[PDB]
Write a protein that binds this DNA or RNA. Structure first.
Length: 131
RNA sequence: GGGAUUUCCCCAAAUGUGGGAAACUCCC
């Protein structure tokens, strides 16, 4: 039960009187988007709370719209990373329960799903020392 | 010693913040 396996902003501490109480959680998860949404829509929809974090090589904001594995189209889930941690907590308390394009949506903290089953992320080849 | 900037390399489905390496300048 609860928000997630980390419990959402439930154990965050002073998050009831402050928009901080986080630092390693500048990311938020979103639900209810629908198929009408895209990277430019989410980032342009969330940026009003604070700046969306940019990827270090793709140049786009750090977003991805998730899809149904049973049909291969938008599930209505997405994940938006904020460039600032206090903007993520505010965007959760704010966007959760309102609409996005006419349909209702939800928002919560986000934490890498891979660290809970896929063993988390992994390194890859490239340049090396003395190169 | 630390922080910021720049550059280079790699798979994609899995669903929620990728890693490694090099250089210069600036700030503490």
């Amino acid at each position: 039960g609860g928000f997630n396996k980390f419990g959402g902003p439930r154990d965050q501490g002073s998050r009831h009187d402050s928009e901080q109480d986080n630092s390693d959680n500048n990311t938020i998860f979103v639900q209810g988007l629908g198929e009408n949404v895209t990277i430019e829509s989410v980032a342009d929809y969330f940026k009003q709370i604070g700046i969306i974090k940019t990827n270090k090589k793709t140049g786009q904001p750090m977003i991805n719209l998730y899809t149904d594995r049973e049909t291969g189209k938008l599930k209505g889930e997405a994940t938006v990373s904020f460039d600032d941690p206090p903007s993520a907590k505010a965007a959760i308390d704010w966007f959760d329960g309102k609409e996005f394009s006419g349909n209702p949506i939800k928002v919560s903290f986000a934490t890498r799903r891979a660290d809970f089953n896929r063993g988390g992320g992994n390194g890859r080849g490239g340049r090396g020392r003395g190169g």
